[PDB]
Amino acid sequence: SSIGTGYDLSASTFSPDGRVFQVEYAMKAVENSSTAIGIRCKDGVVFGVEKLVLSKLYEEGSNKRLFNVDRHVGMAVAGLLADARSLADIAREEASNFRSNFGYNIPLKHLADRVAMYVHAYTLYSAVRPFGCSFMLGSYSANDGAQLYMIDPSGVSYGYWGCAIGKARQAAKTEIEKLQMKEMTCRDVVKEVAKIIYIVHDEVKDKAFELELSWVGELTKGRHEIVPKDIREEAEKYAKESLK
Amino acid sequence: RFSPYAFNGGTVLAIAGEDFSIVASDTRLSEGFSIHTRDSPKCYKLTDKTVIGCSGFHGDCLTLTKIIEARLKMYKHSNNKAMTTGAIAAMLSTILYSRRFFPYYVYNIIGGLDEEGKGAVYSFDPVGSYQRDSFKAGGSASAMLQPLLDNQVGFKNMQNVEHVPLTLDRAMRLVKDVFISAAERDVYTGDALRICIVTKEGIREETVPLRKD
Amino acid sequence: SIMSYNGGAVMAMKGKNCVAIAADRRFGIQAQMVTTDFQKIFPMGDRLYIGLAGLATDVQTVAQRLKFRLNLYELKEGRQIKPYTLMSMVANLLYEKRFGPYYTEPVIAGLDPKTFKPFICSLDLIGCPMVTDDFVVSGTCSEQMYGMCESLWEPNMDPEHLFETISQAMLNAVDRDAVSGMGVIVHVIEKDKITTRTLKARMD
Amino acid sequence: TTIMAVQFNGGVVLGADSRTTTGSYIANRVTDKLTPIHDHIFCCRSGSAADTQAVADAVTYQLGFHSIELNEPPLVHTAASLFKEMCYRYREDLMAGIIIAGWDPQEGGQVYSVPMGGMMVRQSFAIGGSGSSYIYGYVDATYREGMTKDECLQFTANALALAMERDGSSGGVIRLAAIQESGVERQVLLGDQIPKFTIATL
Amino acid sequence: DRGVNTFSPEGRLFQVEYAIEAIKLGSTAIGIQTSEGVCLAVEKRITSPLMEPSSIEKIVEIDAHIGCAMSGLIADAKTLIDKARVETQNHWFTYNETMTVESVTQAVSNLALQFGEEDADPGAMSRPFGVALLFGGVDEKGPQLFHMDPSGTFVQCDARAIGSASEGAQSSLQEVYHKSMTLKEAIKSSLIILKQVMEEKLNATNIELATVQPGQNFHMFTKEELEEVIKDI
Amino acid sequence: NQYDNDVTVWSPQGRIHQIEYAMEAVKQGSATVGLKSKTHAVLVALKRAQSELAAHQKKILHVDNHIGISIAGLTADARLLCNFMRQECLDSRFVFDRPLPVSRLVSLIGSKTQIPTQRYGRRPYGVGLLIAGYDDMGPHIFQTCPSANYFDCRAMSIGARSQSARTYLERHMSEFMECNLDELVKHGLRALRETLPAEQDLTTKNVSIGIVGKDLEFTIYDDDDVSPFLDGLEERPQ
Amino acid sequence: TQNPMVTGTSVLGVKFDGGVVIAADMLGSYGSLARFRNISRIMRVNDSTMLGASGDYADFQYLKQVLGQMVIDEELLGDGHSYSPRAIHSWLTRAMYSRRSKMNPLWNTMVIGGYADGESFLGYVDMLGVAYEAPSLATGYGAYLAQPLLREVLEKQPVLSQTEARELVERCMRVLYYRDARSYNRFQIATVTEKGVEIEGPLSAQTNWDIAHMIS
Amino acid sequence: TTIAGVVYKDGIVLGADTRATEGMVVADKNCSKIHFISPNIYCCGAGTAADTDMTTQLISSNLELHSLTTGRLPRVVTANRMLKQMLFRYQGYIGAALVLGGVDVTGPHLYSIYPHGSTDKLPYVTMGSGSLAAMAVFEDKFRPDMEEEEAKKLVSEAIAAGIFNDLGSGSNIDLCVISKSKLDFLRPFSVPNKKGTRLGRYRCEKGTTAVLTEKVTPLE
Ligand SMILES: *[C@@](C)(CO)[C@](*)(O)[C@H](Cc1ccccc1)NC(=O)[C@H](Cc1ccc(OC)cc1)NC(=O)[C@H](C)NC(=O)CN1CCOCC1
Numbered sequence A: 001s002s003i004g005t006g007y008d009l010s011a012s013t014f015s016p017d018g019r020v021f022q023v024e025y026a027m028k029a030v031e032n033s034s035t036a037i038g039i040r041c042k043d044g045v046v047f048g049v050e051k052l053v054l055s056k057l058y059e060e061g062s063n064k065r066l067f068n069v070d071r072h073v074g075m076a077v078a079g080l081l082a083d084a085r086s087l088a089d090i091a092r093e094e095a096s097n098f099r100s101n102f103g104y105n106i107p108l109k110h111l112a113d114r115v116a117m118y119v120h121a122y123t124l125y126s127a128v129r130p131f132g133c134s135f136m137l138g139s140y141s142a143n144d145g146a147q148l149y150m151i152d153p154s155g156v157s158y159g160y161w162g163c164a165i166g167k168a169r170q171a172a173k174t175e176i177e178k179l180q181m182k183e184m185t186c187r188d189v190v191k192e193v194a195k196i197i198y199i200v201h202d203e204v205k206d207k208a209f210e211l212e213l214s215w216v217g218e219l220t221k222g223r224h225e226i227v228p229k230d231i232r233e234e235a236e237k238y239a240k241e242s243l244k
Numbered sequence B: 001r002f003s004p005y006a007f008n009g010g011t012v013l014a015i016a017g018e019d020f021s022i023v024a025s026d027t028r029l030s031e032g033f034s035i036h037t038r039d040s041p042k043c044y045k046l047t048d049k050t051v052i053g054c055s056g057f058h059g060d061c062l063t064l065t066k067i068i069e070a071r072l073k074m075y076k077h078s079n080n081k082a083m084t085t086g087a088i089a090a091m092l093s094t095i096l097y098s099r100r101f102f103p104y105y106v107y108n109i110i111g112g113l114d115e116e117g118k119g120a121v122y123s124f125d126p127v128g129s130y131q132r133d134s135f136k137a138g139g140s141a142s143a144m145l146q147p148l149l150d151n152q153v154g155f156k157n158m159q160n161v162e163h164v165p166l167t168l169d170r171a172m173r174l175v176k177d178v179f180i181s182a183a184e185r186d187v188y189t190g191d192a193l194r195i196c197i198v199t200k201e202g203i204r205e206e207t208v209p210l211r212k213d
Numbered sequence C: 001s002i003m004s005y006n007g008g009a010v011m012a013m014k015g016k017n018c019v020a021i022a023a024d025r026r027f028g029i030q031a032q033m034v035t036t037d038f039q040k041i042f043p044m045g046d047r048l049y050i051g052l053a054g055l056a057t058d059v060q061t062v063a064q065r066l067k068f069r070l071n072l073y074e075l076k077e078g079r080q081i082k083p084y085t086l087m088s089m090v091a092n093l094l095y096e097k098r099f100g101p102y103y104t105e106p107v108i109a110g111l112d113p114k115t116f117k118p119f120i121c122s123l124d125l126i127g128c129p130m131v132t133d134d135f136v137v138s139g140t141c142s143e144q145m146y147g148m149c150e151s152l153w154e155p156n157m158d159p160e161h162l163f164e165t166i167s168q169a170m171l172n173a174v175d176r177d178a179v180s181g182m183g184v185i186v187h188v189i190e191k192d193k194i195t196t197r198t199l200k201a202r203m204d
Numbered sequence D: 001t002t003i004m005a006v007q008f009n010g011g012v013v014l015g016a017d018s019r020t021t022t023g024s025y026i027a028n029r030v031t032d033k034l035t036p037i038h039d040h041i042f043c044c045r046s047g048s049a050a051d052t053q054a055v056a057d058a059v060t061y062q063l064g065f066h067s068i069e070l071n072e073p074p075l076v077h078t079a080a081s082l083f084k085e086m087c088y089r090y091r092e093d094l095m096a097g098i099i100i101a102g103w104d105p106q107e108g109g110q111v112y113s114v115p116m117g118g119m120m121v122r123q124s125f126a127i128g129g130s131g132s133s134y135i136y137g138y139v140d141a142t143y144r145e146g147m148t149k150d151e152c153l154q155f156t157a158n159a160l161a162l163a164m165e166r167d168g169s170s171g172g173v174i175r176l177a178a179i180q181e182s183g184v185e186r187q188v189l190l191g192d193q194i195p196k197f198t199i200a201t202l
Numbered sequence E: 001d002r003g004v005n006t007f008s009p010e011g012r013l014f015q016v017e018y019a020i021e022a023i024k025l026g027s028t029a030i031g032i033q034t035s036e037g038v039c040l041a042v043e044k045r046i047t048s049p050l051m052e053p054s055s056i057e058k059i060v061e062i063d064a065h066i067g068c069a070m071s072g073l074i075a076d077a078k079t080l081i082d083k084a085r086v087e088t089q090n091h092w093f094t095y096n097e098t099m100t101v102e103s104v105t106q107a108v109s110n111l112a113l114q115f116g117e118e119d120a121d122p123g124a125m126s127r128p129f130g131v132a133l134l135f136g137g138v139d140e141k142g143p144q145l146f147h148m149d150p151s152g153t154f155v156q157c158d159a160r161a162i163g164s165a166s167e168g169a170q171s172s173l174q175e176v177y178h179k180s181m182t183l184k185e186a187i188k189s190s191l192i193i194l195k196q197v198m199e200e201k202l203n204a205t206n207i208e209l210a211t212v213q214p215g216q217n218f219h220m221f222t223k224e225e226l227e228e229v230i231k232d233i
Numbered sequence F: 001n002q003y004d005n006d007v008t009v010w011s012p013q014g015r016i017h018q019i020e021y022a023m024e025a026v027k028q029g030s031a032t033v034g035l036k037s038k039t040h041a042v043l044v045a046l047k048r049a050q051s052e053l054a055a056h057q058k059k060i061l062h063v064d065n066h067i068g069i070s071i072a073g074l075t076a077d078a079r080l081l082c083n084f085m086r087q088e089c090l091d092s093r094f095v096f097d098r099p100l101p102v103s104r105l106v107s108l109i110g111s112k113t114q115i116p117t118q119r120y121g122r123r124p125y126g127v128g129l130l131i132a133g134y135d136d137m138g139p140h141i142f143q144t145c146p147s148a149n150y151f152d153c154r155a156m157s158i159g160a161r162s163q164s165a166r167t168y169l170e171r172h173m174s175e176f177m178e179c180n181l182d183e184l185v186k187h188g189l190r191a192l193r194e195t196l197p198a199e200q201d202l203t204t205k206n207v208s209i210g211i212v213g214k215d216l217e218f219t220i221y222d223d224d225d226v227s228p229f230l231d232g233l234e235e236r237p238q
Numbered sequence G: 001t002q003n004p005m006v007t008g009t010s011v012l013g014v015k016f017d018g019g020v021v022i023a024a025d026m027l028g029s030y031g032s033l034a035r036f037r038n039i040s041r042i043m044r045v046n047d048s049t050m051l052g053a054s055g056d057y058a059d060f061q062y063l064k065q066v067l068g069q070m071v072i073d074e075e076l077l078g079d080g081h082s083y084s085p086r087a088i089h090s091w092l093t094r095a096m097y098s099r100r101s102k103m104n105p106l107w108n109t110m111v112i113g114g115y116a117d118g119e120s121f122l123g124y125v126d127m128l129g130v131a132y133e134a135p136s137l138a139t140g141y142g143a144y145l146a147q148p149l150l151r152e153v154l155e156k157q158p159v160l161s162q163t164e165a166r167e168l169v170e171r172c173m174r175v176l177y178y179r180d181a182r183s184y185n186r187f188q189i190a191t192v193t194e195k196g197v198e199i200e201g202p203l204s205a206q207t208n209w210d211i212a213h214m215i216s
Numbered sequence H: 001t002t003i004a005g006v007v008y009k010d011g012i013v014l015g016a017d018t019r020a021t022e023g024m025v026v027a028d029k030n031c032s033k034i035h036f037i038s039p040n041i042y043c044c045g046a047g048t049a050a051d052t053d054m055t056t057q058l059i060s061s062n063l064e065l066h067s068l069t070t071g072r073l074p075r076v077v078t079a080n081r082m083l084k085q086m087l088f089r090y091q092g093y094i095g096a097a098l099v100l101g102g103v104d105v106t107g108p109h110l111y112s113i114y115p116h117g118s119t120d121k122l123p124y125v126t127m128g129s130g131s132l133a134a135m136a137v138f139e140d141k142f143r144p145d146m147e148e149e150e151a152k153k154l155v156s157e158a159i160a161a162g163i164f165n166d167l168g169s170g171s172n173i174d175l176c177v178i179s180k181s182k183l184d185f186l187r188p189f190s191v192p193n194k195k196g197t198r199l200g201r202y203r204c205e206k207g208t209t210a211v212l213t214e215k216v217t218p219l220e
């Protein structure tokens, strides 16, 4: 990854070794942003995001990196928050179009494919730039079970049991490989998600942070909800206690 | 095929004085031979100085009022001032003419104060034709209210009566009396009479019951 | 009737190695006659003629628009147009106006370039080709022209026999039609010459 | 036409007559009004022959692509929703009375009615077409809760035979189709096979 | 080589910045707002005695109560002045009243950054307007003077100068201008400052003067009108 | 140096310079402050004189009966964006007859401001806004950037030397909620004061105040209207 | 819609002390034929507002889908703002008039009921965009039969209890079944309250037919 | 018109009369109503003649384009779909009633296509104004899997019934036989109607027409 006499100026231009650098630089944007994780349990999916506060003058709840795409679908973002919100709007609209045409809640794998096709469309031309955003999508159904997907700036879509996107993605994934998520209840996962975030967070280099948590599963009747303050505060107590 | 219009009845009245303006209307909303509601006052405030009254097809009256309010803010944002009564009357003419080939089935009467604090009344047709006058009736009962006003306020057809300036009290009694008289003959008019009074300090409302049959 | 507004009558006939085309000369608006020297037969290239009957405007408009395409054809191609090719060009032109047609029913008569072989056809207002080996008619006196041609036409007629037949056919059919007449022009097409004649006819 | 679909436990039973009319002339005395849309999903067509056909062909195309993309055996409700969208958007242009009936691994046997307006409703049994008028009384008197597959076949055949008997714009041959998990099975009734209810007068 | 909508590292648009530089090449113009009215002065800057001075119009009326003086690329102002004229007449047609000086200024200011390359109409502007405008008029809020630049920023001024010599003219106004001077003093002051900065000698032909006041409409000063004020050496 | 010409060009660092340069316009603009209580939301803005003989440039603009904005950066981009905000508000009242929730308007800006940052030959909106509003959820102070990112604020200040105004609001943020309207404005312009060089202070000429809250609709106080708030000038220490 | 097909008849509504009650029979008539005997013509919009629709059922199914999504879209944001009954009423007036003005009307007549912030809401909407509020509402033949009875009671007693309003509706639905030839003795009762929106299953009105024997 | 089609043992027989009418007068005594679609599929046409010609030529053109791309012999279903989807799109304003017949890699197929875009697949179909007369013959004499000569006789008799009974039909009987290895386009299969010989002489002799003007233009 070097040559840039052209090649790296447009997404419609290949490098001599066959790479689209504009997509790779768009991926660098998500690499610079703070870490976001999501874990697929036995009965749902839990999301966790380290939200870095730039100023104490911002209200608790500002720059929310957790989104409701549909009444049953959640979205956690990393990277350029402007692109993240517009991608959420696209996901919202795709999910509502499905209901308006077919009469039921959009299956996650289909929603993930549709959105990823949109993401990919921004990697082919000089007229547009790729999204500087990676996002995860979570949903739980009685007929489909727990499902978790992740889409990167290129438009690639995969199903995950556990996934990390952001600054310390490789550092976070080593902590998630320690968990037996397939047998775990989503009540226990919240505790573990909070722990991983606190470990991965840089105490000295980055300032203070707010922990954002959401879930969708059996416990929440299939609806994607923000984790209640009493349960969130319990997990933060537990995550700080893990720092012995 | 399908009729995009309905006649809902209702009559609006306005009288311009020296320092006041009265905008009055019955509160009955009709269709065919039945009453929709007995509580539907047609007079509506726009600014501190201007009141509008709409009669005819209620669908259009509701829409048109919602258009005017939007436009009032649009003017306010751009020109940094409230729209004057004359400017509202002039604008309404263009809004009504914009639908020349698909007319608003609507009779408007604007009442309020002009730029010198005097009473002003503006009468409209469905397609936007308008003028300033001292008193006007518009609606299902306009043919009944008008001749009496032309006689009493306009002093027409009487031989020797010195033209005494209108007082607020006499104009209020005249308004109440013509509507009571209208409720006797026009089937669309009745229930209650709503009266708006525009003066130096805000707008006042008064309500007198009418025949309910 | 829309076709009866201007009147008109156009005819074509096959000979031995020749082909004749005749038309009436009246231009009228309903009952009133206006012009006595109105043109309805148009040259499309030496040994190829089109006759147009119907609404006088479209009679002119089609001829003018057909000649437009003919000239572009004859310039792009290095050749004169064949009688079958012109027939298809007319059919294409008229069918482009399928739901808003030109009120004219054309009649084409000519000899085939190189092989000098006779050709006759008639068309719809929406351009349906109809080829025959004897005669084709179009006009307000459609029925009258048929009665004459079915009883006068002979299999192998020479240029002069052909002339006499189309002349009698056009002349006597027109005489039973109120909106057709005021003279008849005849074009006879041989390999080496073209004979144009105007006949002595009733002017009522 | 007369068309009919009855839902049983493991799937659905569909039935139609075979008459196509152009005025008072039978243009086609043996018509297959039971149109396959997918493996287990069928539709019954009544109204305009050209209109219903075109919609059917568009739903087949639309559901075909949808199924492959979703990677699931298509829902009967989904196929019915594709009919609804078209029948509602172009309700002023089409004359279509459709009954969509089929099987899917999620909800089993389903019968949906899409009348001329473009509304959609699930029913235990549905009837449509001009001939369905004469059999409302019979169908309401005969229908029983929880009929077996073989009984539903008899029930549709009886109702249709009575309708073809009275209705001029219905007749010919009874076409039956049974759809369950195992697949689709078709049968045809000719002359003697049509349930005879004898001419009942003096 | 970049697009016309490219930001400099300082946070400005190159094309907009360079459009401001074009004014520095235009002929200088002065407007003064007083209690008794608004006066507008501008130098014509004739290059040949064969050229008719009456055809060079840098001060034009928009309505009876609004005048406009311009500096820079005169050709560009054609559209801006026309759009201002259409706006005033559209307002009368709809609202039966005259537009306020601020309203007109704002309407024209909306057109300033209406330029671009991609995602454009079949006739969209390719670049900013290379002109500065001085709107002098009178409405209900008395007499006001507004100044618009290529960036779109419009502001009320008590006294403002625009042009090649707007450096020395602005500082000269900050000496003479009192917020309660008369219109006669205002006209006198402006012409004095104008002749201080002009290359050519000031007379009744090489300059243009107009006044709008609460009493009477936009008035263009003729030769004789000018002689009356020029005579003060 | 070759990635800073278009918005569609990503740099090798994962940055877009055109969006970052557009943000510089907010810094180049005059400083403004916005703070809220439990009932009121107050905008205080410092006006600039181009050449102190012209009037101080406008800073606070109307959006609706419950929403008003303070601008920093390009004026022409500010008016363009304000017209959008005005339009969405008018649309809500036309259709639903209810005031558009502040949060929902701000997120509509977040979508509109994004569109240009991703198309070729386009540019970001070179303006940062401070939105003050009141709805069912109480008072609001919101911040928008040239990057379509927006922030929900306890208190915020943007512009030239806004860092000193930000540190004052940092110190006194624990007092804003239970405090009253008269004290809120005092805190607002005391922050705006900190931006000014030690020579010059606040006057009736250079201060603009916008207030929206529970009892009153959005009102702008400019010249003689601003003096009741200045009366109570605590004077500046350093 | 130029020509309605499957249609629903009367929809009733009256507000009481505590909330609003709405009634509609479960029939979809195809001309004079009673084709669909088991269809719901009442929908729950959100926690605070409900809707009953007269006229073309296919058009109602469209509005049900559109409003359905609107409520879903709001609950996604979770900003603490939700559509008031008055807001849905306002929106519906805008929708119906828009289609009327396009000369392609949604063939419907709606009754909106709601309870928000102590006071109860009841609104009417035409296929033309005629909208108003009223303490009692009735569409179709209900306007000629039920509304007269509803107004007579409210003359004597302006405020009603839930029970009094409910048994009044019972009486109104009984008259409608006697006199309207496009009705059906199987209806739903919908109720807005502080607790939320409840729709109750199949209900029949008890009928008297004694007047058969007294002709002679 | 009268047009008819039959499916027999080896393939398809298609039949048509040769009468075209304008009003209630015969315009063409010998017009071609059986149209070429592909070397293996032919189509009969009835109704608006010009619509018949242009619709049948457009689809023939589109199939050649298709068969050149595939390198394969075109299918009767493709001809059916192409004709069906067009005629429907034009809401029945293109007045083409069609009898489509051909032999595929799938086998022998026969279709009837209506102006509105409704299709039927049947062993025997009739279209045109003489369809009732032709359909009567089929209902009375048709048998499954009949021989080529027998099917030729059947279709011709059906067309004959349309000719001698429908005023819109007349003149010659045309046939088109399509099998797995052979195609017979029998133009005048039968000439059941002939003009009576003119035994009276009316030949107008030379010089019996008066001329006013004459111009002779020589050519190459
Ligand atoms: C029964 C027989 C009659 O109601 C059925 O509904 C049947 C439906 C069917 C037919 C074939 C295949 C599947 C299902 N309907 C018909 O046979 C139908 C009757 C009809 C004609 C016109 C209509 O208005 C649009 C509606 C119904 N017949 C046809 O479609 C025939 C093939 N075509 C014509 O009649 C031609 N019409 C089209 C409309 O304009 C007049 C000429």
Ligand SMILES: *[C@@](C)(CO)[C@](*)(O)[C@H](Cc1ccccc1)NC(=O)[C@H](Cc1ccc(OC)cc1)NC(=O)[C@H](C)NC(=O)CN1CCOCC1
Pocket (backbone or CB within 6 Å): C124, C125, C126, C128, H001, H002, H019, H020, H021, H022, H023, H027, H031, H032, H033, H045, H046, H047, H048, H049, H050, H052, H053, H095, H128, H129, H167, H168, H169
């Ligand atoms: C039999 C003869 C009809 O009785 C056939 O359907 C035949 C089909 C045919 C004939 C020749 C070549 C190919 C196919 N139809 C006709 O001969 C047809 C009859 C007809 C006339 C008018 C109609 O009304 C719409 C429909 C059918 N004849 C013609 O097309 C004649 C030559 N042209 C016209 O009548 C001109 N019309 C065309 C339609 O618009 C109005 C003017």
